[PDB]
Each structure stands twice: as C-alpha cells, then as structure tokens.
Amino acid sequence: MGNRAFKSHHGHFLSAEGEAVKTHHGHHDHHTHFHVENHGGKVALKTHCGKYLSIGDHKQVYLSHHLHGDHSLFHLEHHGGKVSIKGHHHHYISADHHGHVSTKEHHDHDTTFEEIII
C-alpha cells in the first residue's frame, strides 16, 4: 500500500522523473511518485499508468509494462522498520550513494530502504 517513494538511506528516495528513474528527497511537485500494490503471491511496483520496476542484466535497471511473474513484478517485504525489494536471481534492489541504483545479491542496509507514503 504505497503512493510515494522508497527511501534509500541518507534522505533520498527512488522516485521516477521525465523518462527515467531518479532519487529525490520529497519536496516539490510530484507526478512521478510510486505505488506499491499486491499481485497474487507477490507485490508490484507501479508508476501511475503503465510501468513496473524492471531489471535487465549487467547492473542495468529500468521499468517495463504490465505482466505476471517476478523481475518485473516483485517480492518486497518489511524489515523491523525498513524494507527490502527482491526480484530474480535472488537479488534485492540497491541504491548506493556511489553507484546509484542497481541490485545486489547481499542483503543488510545497502539493499534495504524505508517506505514513504502520503
């Protein structure tokens, strides 16, 4: 149940923007927020009209259309106070100061975020 963004530490949260994914605080404007919603045995990441978190390979990360499965639709779960998102190959999503957003096989904080709502 979410209609805003995911905090990846420090104070920035994955958000969408123009034709690409970015990380912002909260702030101005809008319109490229992000919605969590369930899908059968897992959960989906969906921006407002046609787009679901998607991962390519080689640390390349983007967003695809509607579909069923994992990789695109995801399995994401809470963590005490934080969150963790996971898709294919046993990787979780990552957001690292140094290498922006990608995914990692490990799982501790670097691949664990907050949940921000409205």
> What does the alpha-carbon distance between residue 118 and residue 75 come to, in Å, rounded to a whole number?
22
Contact 36, 52 (CB under 8 A): no
Domain that holds residue 14: 1-118
- Give which of 34, 28, 40, 27 is closest to 115, Cα–Cα: 34
Please report where in the chains the tokens 């969590």 appear, as a residue.
36
How far lies 84's CA from each of 31, 54, 92, 101, in Å?
24, 15, 7, 14
How far lies 50's CA from each of 8, 45, 66, 80, in Å?
24, 11, 6, 31
Q: One-letter amino acid identity for 78?
A: H
> What does the alpha-carbon distance between residue 1 and residue 48 come to, in Å, rounded to a whole number?
13
- CA 84 from chain centre, in angstroms, equals 9
Count of domains for the chain: 1
- Give which of 103, 104, 98, 118 is closest to 10, Cα–Cα: 98
Method for structure elucidation:
NMR
> Which residues, 6+ apart, have CB-to-CB distance to 51 below 8 Å?
16, 63, 64, 65
Residue 83 belongs to domain with CATH number: 2.80.10.50
